[PDB]
Amino acid sequence: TSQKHRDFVAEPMGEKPVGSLAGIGEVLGKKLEERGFDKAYVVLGQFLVLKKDEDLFREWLKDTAGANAKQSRDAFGALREWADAF
Ligand SMILES: [Cs+]
Ligand SMILES: [Cs+]
């Protein structure tokens, strides 16, 4: 199961790795780690630097991590939900 939406939002981000964010696979996490998005805090940062736009974060995550629709959407929802919480 990839039901890690709950585990990410029931505590703060902190020094959490990128692969801990929902939709960030073990393969995606490598393509993301070499660009300097090694932690889930760095992806949160990019999403805020994009003003939390859904299809701009999803456009960048495709243009960089090589993400698919389910991966890019599950990642955005997890960031949006965590922003909506803390
Ligand atoms: Cs970077
Ligand atoms: Cs809140």
Residue numbers in the entry: 3 to 88
From the manuscript:
Barrier-to-autointegration factor (BAF), encoded by the BANF1 gene, is an abundant and ubiquitously expressed metazoan protein that has multiple functions during the cell cycle. Through its ability to cross-bridge two double-stranded DNA (dsDNA), it favours chromosome compaction, participates in post-mitotic nuclear envelope reassembly and is essential for the repair of large nuclear ruptures. Phosphorylation of BAF by the vaccinia-related kinase 1 (VRK1) is a key regulator of BAF localization and function. Here, we demonstrate that VRK1 successively phosphorylates BAF on Ser4 and Thr3.
In order to obtain a detailed view of the structural consequences of BAF phosphorylation, we crystallized pBAF and solved its 3D structure at a resolution of 3.2 Å. While NMR revealed large chemical shift changes between BAF and pBAF, we did not observe any major structural changes due to phosphorylation in the crystal. Only helix 1 is significantly shortened in pBAF compared to BAF: it comprises residues 4–12 in BAF and is restricted to residues 7–11 in pBAF. And only residues Thr3, Ser4 and Gln5 have a Cα atom displaced by more than 2 Å after fitting the two structures. However, comparison of the dynamics of BAF and pBAF in solution by NMR revealed that the motions observed in BAF are strongly reduced in pBAF. As pThr3 and pSer4 are close to positively charged residues in helix α6 (Lys72, Arg75), electrostatic interactions between the phosphorylated side chains and helix α6 could explain the strong decrease in pBAF flexibility. We showed that the crystal structures of BAF and di-phosphorylated (pBAF) are similar. However, in solution, BAF exhibits large motions on both fast (picosecond to nanosecond) and slow (microsecond to milliesecond) timescales, which are not observed in pBAF. Thus, phosphorylation of Ser4 and Thr3 drastically reduces the conformational mobility of BAF. Consistently, phosphorylation causes a 5000-fold loss of affinity for dsDNA.
